[PDB]
RNA sequence: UUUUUUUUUUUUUUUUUUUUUUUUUUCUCCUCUUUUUUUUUUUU
């Protein structure tokens, strides 16, 4: 196996096609990273050559991506969050987000009271939809059956458990509270 | 013995800032007269 530097001759446009993290010019394929030389043969020949470091310390979000978050504060019409994980991998820093009162459920419906959906301190799984404005920057959504709060936390510091699609209950004091439970 | 119709109060809010009293002119300028200078001493 061989590694890369962010420029070198790799292949012709006839001997393969550019993949992820690469660029081409003057009929040649040029590297743009310092990762590893991967040639996805796939099926149909002409492998899509690409270079991947495979050790992602940081990664910029996209138009569509799954992210693990952490609520900071909640408002009657939005809920500021902090992006913590990009899908699976840990993130070295923390970005910001905002869930408007249209992205909670998968119907973009009326009602949907924000107060009992995303209580602060929880950890949720959500998907971005846009690159946002300067007020709200990433505009995340949870309009799916698989998205919502996944690992909640009790009033007094006890791991919480899902109890229904909308209700969760404390194991110690048997107290009933409202969340937006995502499928496991 | 006089029917029917002619809408109404702009939409928006979740912006960063790492200095410090004052502050800046005015020129050279004839001093009049008994003196050397008296002086110990004691009573505070």
Nucleotide nearest to A77 (CA to C1'): B14
Q: Domain of residue A37: give its range.
A: 1-56
Q: State the Cα–Cα distance between residues A83 and A69, nearest whole angstrom.
A: 5
Resolution in A: 3.7
SS3 A85: strand
Report how far apart, in Å, the C-alpha atoms of A18 and of each of A9, A44, A85, A92, A117 are. 12, 15, 28, 29, 44
SS3 A64: coil
Of chain A, the end-to-end C-alpha distance in Å amounts to: 39
Q: State the Cα–Cα distance between residues A147 and A144, nearest whole angstrom.
A: 5
Q: State the Cα–Cα distance between residues A4 and A132, nearest whole angstrom.
A: 34
Three-state secondary structure of A86-137: ECCEECCCCCCEECCCCCCCCCCCCCCCCCCCCCCCCEEEEEECCCCCCCCC
Tally of helices (H runs) and strands (E runs) in chain A: 0, 15
- A86/B28 CA-to-C1' distance in Å: 89
In contact, A140 and A67? CB cutoff 8 Å: yes
Nucleotides of B under 7 A from a protein CB: 13-15
Sign for the CA dihedral angle at A103, A106, A112, A118 comes to negative
Q: How was this structure determined?
A: cryo-EM
Residues pairing with A24 in the sheet: A29
- A100/B10 CA-to-C1' distance in Å: 23
């Amino acid at each position: 196996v061989r590694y890369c530097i962010p420029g070198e001759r790799l292949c012709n446009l006839e001997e393969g096609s550019p993949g992820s993290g690469t660029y081409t010019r003057h009929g040649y394929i040029f590297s743009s990273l310092a990762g590893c030389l991967m040639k996805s043969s796939e099926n149909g020949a002409l492998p899509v050559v690409s270079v991947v470091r495979e050790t992602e310390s940081q990664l910029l979000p996209d138009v569509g991506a799954i992210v693990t978050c952490k609520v900071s504060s909640i408002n009657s019409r939005f809920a500021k969050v902090h992006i913590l994980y990009v899908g699976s991998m840990p993130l070295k820093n923390s970005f910001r987000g905002t869930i408007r009162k249209e992205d909670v459920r998968a119907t973009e419906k009326d009602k949907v009271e924000i107060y009992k959906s995303f209580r602060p301190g929880d950890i949720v799984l959500a998907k971005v939809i846009s690159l946002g404005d300067a007020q709200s920057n990433y505009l995340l959504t949870t309009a799916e059956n698989e998205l919502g709060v996944v690992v909640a936390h009790s009033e007094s510091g006890i791991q919480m458990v899902p109890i229904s699609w909308c209700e969760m209950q404390c194991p110690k004091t048997h107290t009933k509270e409202f969340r937006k439970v995502a499928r496991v």
